[PDB]
Amino acid sequence: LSKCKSELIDAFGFLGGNAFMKDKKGKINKQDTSLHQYASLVDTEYEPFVMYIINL
Amino acid sequence: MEGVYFNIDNGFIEGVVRGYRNGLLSNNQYINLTQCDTLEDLKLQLSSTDYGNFLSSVSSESLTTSLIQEYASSKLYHEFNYIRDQSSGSTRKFMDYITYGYMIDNVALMITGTIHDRDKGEILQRCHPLGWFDTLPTLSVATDLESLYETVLVDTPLAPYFKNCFDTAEELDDMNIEIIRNKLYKAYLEDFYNFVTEEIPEPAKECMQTLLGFEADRRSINIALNSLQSSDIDPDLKSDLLPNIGKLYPLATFHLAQAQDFEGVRAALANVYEYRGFLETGNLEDHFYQLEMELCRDAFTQQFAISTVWAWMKSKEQEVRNITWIAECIAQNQRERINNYISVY
Amino acid sequence: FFGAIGCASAIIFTSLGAAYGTAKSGVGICATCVLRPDLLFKNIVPVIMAGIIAIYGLVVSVLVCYSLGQKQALYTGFIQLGAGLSVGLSGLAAGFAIGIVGDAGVRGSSQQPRLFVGMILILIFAEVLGLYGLIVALLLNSRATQDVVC
Amino acid sequence: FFGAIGCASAIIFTSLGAAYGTAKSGVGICATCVLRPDLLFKNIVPVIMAGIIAIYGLVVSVLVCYSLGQKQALYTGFIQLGAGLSVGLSGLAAGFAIGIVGDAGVRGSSQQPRLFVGMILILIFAEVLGLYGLIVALLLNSRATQDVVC
Amino acid sequence: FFGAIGCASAIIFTSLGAAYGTAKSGVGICATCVLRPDLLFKNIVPVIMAGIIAIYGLVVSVLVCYSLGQKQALYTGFIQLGAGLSVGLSGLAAGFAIGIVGDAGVRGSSQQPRLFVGMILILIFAEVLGLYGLIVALLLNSRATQDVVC
Amino acid sequence: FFGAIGCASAIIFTSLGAAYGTAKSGVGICATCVLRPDLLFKNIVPVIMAGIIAIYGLVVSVLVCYSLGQKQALYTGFIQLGAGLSVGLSGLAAGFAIGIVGDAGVRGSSQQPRLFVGMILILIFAEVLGLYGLIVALLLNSRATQDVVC
Amino acid sequence: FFGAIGCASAIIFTSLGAAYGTAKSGVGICATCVLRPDLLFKNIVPVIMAGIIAIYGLVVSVLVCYSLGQKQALYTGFIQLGAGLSVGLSGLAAGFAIGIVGDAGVRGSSQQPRLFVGMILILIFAEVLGLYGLIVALLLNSRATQDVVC
Amino acid sequence: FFGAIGCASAIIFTSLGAAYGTAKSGVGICATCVLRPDLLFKNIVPVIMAGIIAIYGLVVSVLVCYSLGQKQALYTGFIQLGAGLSVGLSGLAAGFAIGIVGDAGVRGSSQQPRLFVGMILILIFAEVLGLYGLIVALLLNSRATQDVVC
Amino acid sequence: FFGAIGCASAIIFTSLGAAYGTAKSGVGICATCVLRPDLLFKNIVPVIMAGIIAIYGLVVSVLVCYSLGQKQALYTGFIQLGAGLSVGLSGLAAGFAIGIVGDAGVRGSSQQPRLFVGMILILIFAEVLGLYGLIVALLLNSRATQDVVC
Amino acid sequence: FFGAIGCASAIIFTSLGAAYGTAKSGVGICATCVLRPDLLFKNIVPVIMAGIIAIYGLVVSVLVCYSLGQKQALYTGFIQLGAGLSVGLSGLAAGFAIGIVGDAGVRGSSQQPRLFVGMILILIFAEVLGLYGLIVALLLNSRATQDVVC
Amino acid sequence: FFGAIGCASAIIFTSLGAAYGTAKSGVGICATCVLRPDLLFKNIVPVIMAGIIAIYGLVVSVLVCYSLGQKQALYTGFIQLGAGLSVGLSGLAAGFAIGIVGDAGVRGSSQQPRLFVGMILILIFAEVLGLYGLIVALLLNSRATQDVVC
Amino acid sequence: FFGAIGCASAIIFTSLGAAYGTAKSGVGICATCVLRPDLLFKNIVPVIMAGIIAIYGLVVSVLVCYSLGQKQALYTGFIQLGAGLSVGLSGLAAGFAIGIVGDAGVRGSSQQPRLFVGMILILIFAEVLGLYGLIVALLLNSRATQDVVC
C-alpha cells in the first residue's frame, strides 16, 4: 500500500497544481500523532489528485 | 522528627500562609455569620477576613450570586496562583499536585459539558491551579482526547492529568459520565499518598496522616452511596482499591466502595466514628465536613512543614463552599440549612 | 599545630550556626512584608541575636593565636584544639536554635506585633548555650599557658 | 590530651540537646501564643527545662578543665573523656524529650488549659536522665585526675 | 580508660532510649487529653515506663566507676566497656518499643477507657528486655573480678 | 577480651529483635481492641512470643561469664565472640518476623476466632531459629573455653 | 577460630532468610484469612516451604560446633569458614525469594482456591540454591576437620 | 585466605542472582495465574532458567577449597580470589536481567499465549553471560590448583 | 596480584553491562509485542546488540588464563590488569547505552518500519566502544607476559 | 607548601560559597524581572552582596603565597594551612545565608517592593561572620612567619 | 604502577562520556522520529558527535600503552598518569554536555528546520573540552617517550 | 610526584565547570528557540560565557606538565600542587553559577528584550571567581617551575 500511494502521487499530482502539492508522505496507524494521513477534508493536508484509499 | 528544616521555598510560602492566618475565617466566624438576617450585619462581620478584604473594596448590599464568583477569582489568584511561581524544589511540586488534584475532576466536567454545550470559556469557583485565562479555557473548548495532551505539555510541572488521560484514551471506563469520575477520584487518592510517602522523613505527620486515610475512606463511601440505586459497574474502574494494612485491606476497601452495602468491611471502617456508611445522603454530608475540617485546624500549629501547607489548601475549598451558602441566603432574607446544623465547618 | 586548627574549628562552626540562624529568619521577614509592610522594626531583631554569637567566638580565636607554644607538642595542641571546639559548636548550637524559634517568631510578629516581645524572650534563652561554652573555652586557653607552658 | 575534648564534648552535646528542644517547642509556642494572648506565662516554663540541663553540664566541664595537669598520657586522657561523654549525650537525649512533648503540649494547653500542670509532670520525667549522667560524671572526674597514669 | 567509656556507653544509649519513650508517648497523651482529661491517671502509666530504665543503668554505672583502677590492662578494659554497652543498647530498644506502644495504647484509652489494664500489660512485656540486659551486665562485672575489675 | 563482647552481643541483638516485635504487635492490638473488646486473651500470645528467646540468651552469657579467665588469645577470643553472635542474631531476626505477622494477624483473630491457632503457628516457625542459635552458642563456648593462659 | 566465624555466618544469614520468608508469606496469609478461612490448611503450605531450608542451616552449624577443638590452624579454619558461607547466603537468598513469590500467591489463592499447587511449584525451584549449598558445605566441613591442618 | 574469598564471591552472588530472578518472575506469574490458569506449564519455564546458575558456582567453589594450601602465595592465592569473582558477578548479572525479562514476559503469556516462545528467545540471551563466567572461572581454578606453592 | 583481578574485572563488568541492556530493552519489548506480534524479529535485533559485547570479552579473558597460573610480579600483573579493564569498561558502558536507546527505540521500530535502519544506527554507535576496549586489550595481552620482575 | 594548601582552601571554599549565593539569588531575580521589569535596579543589589566574600579570600591568599618562598619550617606550615581553612569555610557558610535570604527577598519585592531596603539590611548582618574570621587569619599568618615561634 | 593508572584512566573515562552522549541524545531522537519521518537527516548529526570524543581518547590510550612497562623510571610513570587523567575526565564531561543539550535539541529540530543550525552551534562549544584534554595529554606523551611515542 | 596531581586537578575541574554551564544553559535555549524564533543572537551569549575559563586553565596546565621530574622535592612539590588546586575548583565554581543563572536567564530574554543586558550581568559577577584562582595560581607557579626535577 505504502509503495502504491507514493507512485501515484509522484506521477499524477502535477495535474492538480503545484499549490495543491504537499509533502507529509508516510502513514501512522498508531495514536501517537494524527499527521501523515491524507483527506481533502482537513486543512492539515490534501490529496493532490482525486484519490480515495479504501480499507476493508 | 522535626527541626532539621532548611527549605528556602517552604519558609516563603509559610510566611504568606501565616499572614493570612491573622485574617483567617474560623468556626467562630461562621457561627456568628449564620445568626444574621439583615444585609448590613453580615457584611460588617465578614469584612476583616481574607475574603472580607474584597467586600470592603466594593461595598455591595445585594450580595447576589455573581458577586461571590468575582470574589473567588481575586482570592484564588492572589493566595494560590502567584505564590507557586515564586516557589521551587519539592515545595513547588507538592503544592502544585494537591491543587491539580481538584483540577483533574473539574477538567473532565468542562470537556464532557462542551459536547453537550455548556460554556466555552467560563469556568466557575473552586480551588484550582490556574486561572480562567491561563490553561483551563484551552482545556474546556476541546471535545477530542488528542488536544488535551498538547495543552498539558505546555505548563510545567507535568499535570497528573497526563497519565489519567492515557488510561481514558483506551476506554477502560467508557463514555458513561459517572464511571469516568469515579476512576479519577481513585487516582486522586492514590497519587496524594505517594507524594506524602516521599515527603515524610522531614516533617511529622500524625493528624495529617490519619486525616488523609479518613479522607480516602469518606470518598469510598461517597462513590458507593451515589452508584447505589443505579448499580455499580465492577468490570470498569468505579470502585476504590486503596493501600490499607490495618483493619482493612485492598480486598476490603474494594467491597466498601462498590454498591453492595457489605457490613463486615463496615465493622472495620468504623466502630466509634459517627460516619459508618449510611444509605442517608444528608447525614453523611454533615459529618464529612466536620470530620474533614478537624485535624486541619490542629495542623496549623505546626509551621515550616509540608504538613501545614496541605491542611491550608484543604481548608480553603471547604471555606469557599461555606461562604457561598451564607452570602446567598441573606441577600434573599432566609436562614441557612447546612451551616446552621454543624458547629464545625 | 592542632592549636592553630583550634582557631580554625572555632571560626567555622560559629559562622555556620549564625548563618543558619540569619538564613531561616530572613526568609520569614521576606514573607511577612507582602501583606503587612511596617512590622520591619520588630522583624529585624531576630537576625541580630545570632550575630552576637560570633563576637564572643572572636575573643577565643585571637587568645589561642597568642597562646601557641614554641613548636608546641602533641599534648599542647590538643588543649588548644579542645578550646576551639568548645566555643565553636556551643556557638553553632545556640545559632541553630535562634534560627528555627526566630523564623516561627516573625510569622508570630505578623499576626500579633504586641506579644512579639514574648518571642524575643525565647530567643535569649538559647544564647546561654553559647555563653557556657565560651566560659569553658577561655579556661582551656589559660590552662595551655599555665604549668610553665604545656 | 583527650580530656580537653572531654570538656568540649560536655558543653557542646548538651547544647545541641537544648537547641533542638528549644527549637521544636518554640515553633509550637509561636503558633498557639498569637491566638490566645494569656498563655505566654505558661509557655516560659516548658522552655526553661532544656536551658537547665546545660548548667549541670557546665560544672562537669569546669572540674575536667582543672583536672588537666601537664603532659598527660593517652590512658589518663581516656578516663577524663569518658566522664565528659556522660553528661554531653545524656543532655543530648534529654533535650530531645523536652522538645517533642513541649511542642505537642502547646496544643494540649490550648484545648485544656486546666491541664497545663499535667503536661509539666510528663516533662519532669525526661529530666531524670540529666540527673543520672551528671552524678556519674562527678564520680569519674574525681578519680580521673592522675596527671600521667597513677 | 575503657571503663570510663563503659559508664559513658551505658549513659548514652539508655538516655536516648528513655527520651524516645517520653517523647513518643507524651505526644499521644496530649492528643487524647483534648477529648478527655480524666484519663490523665491512665495515660501516665505508659509514659513512665521508659524513665525507670535509666535508674537501673545508674546502679551498674556507679558500680563500674568504683571498679575503675588507676592502671589497667586491655583485658580489664573490655569487661567494663562490654558491660556498659549491654545495658545501654538493651535500654535503647526497650525505651523505643515502649514509646510506640505508649502513643498507640493512649489512643486505645481514649476510645475505650476500660481495657486500660490491657494496654499496661502490652508495655510490661517490652520492659523485660531492659531488665535481662541489666542483669547480664552487673553479673559479668561481679564474676569477672580481675582485681575487683581494677 | 573478644569473649566479654560475646556476652554483650548475644543479649543486645536479641533484646532489639523482641522490642521491635512488641512495639509492632502493640500498635495493632490497641487498634483491633476498638472493634472487639474481648480479645485480651488472644492478644497476649503474639506480643509475648518473641521475648522468650532472651531468657535463653541470659543463661548462655552466664556460662560464658563464669568460664572467663584473665588472659585469652586471639584464637580463643574469636570463638566466644562468634558464639554470642549466634544467639543475638537469630533472636534479632525471629523478633522482627514475629511482630509483623503478629500485628496483622490480630485482624484475623478478631474476625475469625477459629484461626487463632493458625496465627500462633506462623510465628512458631521463627522460634526454632532462636532455639538452635542458643544450642549452637553453648557447644561453641564449651570447646573454646579452657580458662586462663591459652 | 576462623571456623567459629563460619558457623556464625551460616546460623545468622539462613535465620535471617527464613525470617523474611515467614514475614512476607505471613502478612499475605493474614490478609486472606478474614475472607477465606477454609483455605488455611493450604495457606499453611507456602509459608512452611521456606522453613524447610532453615532447619538444614541450623544443623550445619551444629555440625561445625562438634568439629571444632580447643584451637585449630589457619588451613582448617579457612575451609570451615568458607563452608559456613555456602549455607548462610544460599539459605538467606532462597529464604527471601520464597517469601516474595509466596505473598503474591496467597492473594491468587484467595481468588482461585483450586490452583494452590501451582504456587508451590514456583516456590520449590528456589530451594536448589540452598539445598545445594547445605550439601557442599556439609561435605567440606567433614573433610576439613582434623584440628590443625586439613 | 584469598581461597576463602574465592569460595565467598562465587556462592554468595550467584545465589542472590537466582533468588532475584525467581522472586520477580514469581510476582508476575501469581498475578497472571488467576487470569489464565492452564498456562501454568509455560509460566514455569522462565522460573527454572535462573536456578541452574547456582549449581555451576558451587562446583567451582568445592575445587577452589582443595587448591588452597597453607604455604601462602599471593599470586596463586589471587587466581582463586579472582576465579570466584568471575562466576559470582556474572551469575548475579544474569539473575538481575532474567527476573526483569521474566516479569514483563508473563504479561505476554496472558494476552498472546501462542507467541510465548518470543519471551523465551529474549530471556535465554542472558545465559551467555553465565557460560562466559563458567568457562573463564574453570580455567583459572585449574591453573590455581597447586595448594598455593610459594 | 592485579593481573588476576584484571581477569576478574573483564568478566564482572561486561556481564553486568549486558544484563542492564537486556533488562531495560526486554520490558519495553515484552510490553510492545502484545499490540502487534509481528515485531518479534525486529525487536530481537536491539536485544542482540548487548549480547555481542561479552563474546569479545571472552576472547581477551581466555588469553590471560594461559599467561596465568605461575607466581608473577608487578610487571606482568599491571599490564594484565589494564587489559582486563579495557574489555570491562566498554562492556559496562556500551551495554548501558544500548538499553536506554533500545527502550525508547521500541516505539521507533513499532511506528516506523522505514526509519528502523535509523534506530539500528544509534545502537551501532555504541558498538564502536566494544571494539576500542577489545583491540587495545588484545595488544596489551601479548606484551604483558614477561613473567615475574618487580 | 602546607601553606600552598592554605592559599588554595581560602580561595576555593569561598568561591564556592559565592557561587552558591549567586546561583539561588539569580533564579529569583530572573523571574522577578519578567513580572515587573522596573525592579532590575533593586534586584541586583542582593546578588552582589554574596560576591563580597570572594574578594576577601583573594587577599589572604596573595599575602601568604609571597611569604612562602620555597622553604619554611614544618611547624610554620601547619599554622598557615590552618589559617587558610578558617577564612574558607567561614566564607562558605556566610555565602549560604546571603543566598537564601537573597533569593526569598527578590520574591518579596515582586509582590510588594516598598520594603526593598529591608531585604538588603539582613544580608549585611551575615557579612560580619566573614569579617571577624578574615581578621583572625591575618594575625596568625604574620606571626607564624618567623621560622618557629608563633 | 603510575603508568598503569595513566593507561586505565584515559580509556575508561572518555569511553563513559561517549556512551552517555549517544544514549541521552537517542531518547530524544527516537521520540521525534515517530512524529515526523522526515527529520532523519538532522537527527543523525547531534548523536554522532560524542563518538568523535572517544577517538581522540583512543589516541592517548595507545600512546601510553607502548610507554607502559613497570621497569621504566618513575618520571615516565607520572607523565603517563597526567596524560591519562587529562583527556579522560574532560572527555567524560564533554560527553555529558553533548547528551544534555542533545536531548533537549530534538524539539528544536522538529518545529524549526531553519534554527536546527542553532543546536549544532551550542554543541561545537562543548567540544572545546575534548580538545583541551587531548592537547595536554598528546604533549605529555611526546615528553614521556620522545617523537610522539614511536 | 605530588606535582603530577597539580597537573591533573587543574585540567580536570576547570573542564567539569565548562561542561555543567554549557549543559544547563543549553536546555533553556532549546525551549526558547521554538518559543521565540528570533532571539537566537541573545540565546547564544550566556551559553558560551562558560568555556572561556578553560583557556586560562590550559596556560597553567601546559607549564606544570613540562617541568615534572622523576622525584621532586616535598616543599617545592606542594607549591606546584596548590597552584593547580586553585585554578580547577575556581573554574568549576564559576561554571556552576553560570549554568543555574544561565538556565534562568533565557526566560529573561524570552519575555523582555530590553532586560537582556541585566541577565548577562548576573553571569559576569560569577566570572570574577574564575579569574581570581588563575591569578593566585600564576604567582605560585612562577616559582614552582624551574624545569624538569623541581
Swiss-Prot record, chain A:
<comment type="similarity">
    <text>Belongs to the V-ATPase C subunit family.</text>
</comment>
<protein>
    <recommendedName>
        <fullName>V-type proton ATPase subunit C</fullName>
    </recommendedName>
</protein>
<comment type="function">
    <text>Subunit of the V1 complex of vacuolar(H+)-ATPase (V-ATPase), a multisubunit enzyme composed of a peripheral complex (V1) that hydrolyzes ATP and a membrane integral complex (V0) that translocates protons. V-ATPase is responsible for acidifying and maintaining the pH of intracellular compartments. Subunit C is necessary for the assembly of the catalytic sector of the enzyme and is likely to have a specific function in its catalytic activity. Reversibly leaves the enzyme after glucose depletion, causing the catalytic subcomplex V1 to detach from the V0 section.</text>
</comment>
<comment type="subunit">
    <text>V-ATPase is a heteromultimeric enzyme composed of a peripheral catalytic V1 complex (components A to H) attached to an integral membrane V0 proton pore complex (components: a, c, c', c'', d, e, f and VOA1). Interacts directly with VMA4.</text>
</comment>
From Swiss-Prot, chain B:
<dbReference type="InterPro" id="IPR002843">
    <property type="entry name" value="ATPase_V0-cplx_csu/dsu"/>
</dbReference>
<dbReference type="GO" id="GO:0016471">
    <property type="term" value="C:vacuolar proton-transporting V-type ATPase complex"/>
</dbReference>
<comment type="subunit">
    <text>V-ATPase is a heteromultimeric enzyme composed of a peripheral catalytic V1 complex (components A to H) attached to an integral membrane V0 proton pore complex (components: a, c, c', c'', d, e, f and VOA1).</text>
</comment>
<dbReference type="GO" id="GO:0007034">
    <property type="term" value="P:vacuolar transport"/>
</dbReference>
<keyword id="KW-0406">Ion transport</keyword>
<dbReference type="GO" id="GO:0061795">
    <property type="term" value="P:Golgi lumen acidification"/>
</dbReference>
<keyword id="KW-0926">Vacuole</keyword>
<dbReference type="GO" id="GO:0033176">
    <property type="term" value="C:proton-transporting V-type ATPase complex"/>
</dbReference>
<keyword id="KW-0007">Acetylation</keyword>
<dbReference type="GO" id="GO:1902600">
    <property type="term" value="P:proton transmembrane transport"/>
</dbReference>
<keyword id="KW-0375">Hydrogen ion transport</keyword>
<dbReference type="InterPro" id="IPR016727">
    <property type="entry name" value="ATPase_V0-cplx_dsu"/>
</dbReference>
<feature type="modified residue" description="N-acetylmethionine">
    <location>
        <position position="1"/>
    </location>
</feature>
<dbReference type="GO" id="GO:0000139">
    <property type="term" value="C:Golgi membrane"/>
</dbReference>
<dbReference type="Pfam" id="PF01992">
    <property type="entry name" value="vATP-synt_AC39"/>
</dbReference>
Curated annotation (Swiss-Prot), chains C, D, E, F, G, H, I, J, K, L:
<dbReference type="GO" id="GO:0033176">
    <property type="term" value="C:proton-transporting V-type ATPase complex"/>
</dbReference>
<keyword id="KW-1133">Transmembrane helix</keyword>
<comment type="function">
    <text>Proton-conducting pore forming subunit of the V0 complex of vacuolar(H+)-ATPase (V-ATPase), a multisubunit enzyme composed of a peripheral complex (V1) that hydrolyzes ATP and a membrane integral complex (V0) that translocates protons. V-ATPase is responsible for acidifying and maintaining the pH of intracellular compartments.</text>
</comment>
<keyword id="KW-0406">Ion transport</keyword>
<feature type="site" description="Essential for proton translocation">
    <location>
        <position position="127"/>
    </location>
</feature>
<dbReference type="GO" id="GO:0015078">
    <property type="term" value="F:proton transmembrane transporter activity"/>
</dbReference>
<keyword id="KW-0926">Vacuole</keyword>
<feature type="topological domain" description="Cytoplasmic">
    <location>
        <begin position="22"/>
        <end position="43"/>
    </location>
</feature>
<dbReference type="GO" id="GO:0000329">
    <property type="term" value="C:fungal-type vacuole membrane"/>
</dbReference>
<dbReference type="Pfam" id="PF00137">
    <property type="entry name" value="ATP-synt_C"/>
</dbReference>
<dbReference type="GO" id="GO:0016471">
    <property type="term" value="C:vacuolar proton-transporting V-type ATPase complex"/>
</dbReference>
<feature type="transmembrane region" description="Helical">
    <location>
        <begin position="115"/>
        <end position="140"/>
    </location>
</feature>
<comment type="similarity">
    <text>Belongs to the V-ATPase proteolipid subunit family.</text>
</comment>
<dbReference type="GO" id="GO:0007035">
    <property type="term" value="P:vacuolar acidification"/>
</dbReference>
<dbReference type="InterPro" id="IPR000245">
    <property type="entry name" value="ATPase_proteolipid_csu"/>
</dbReference>
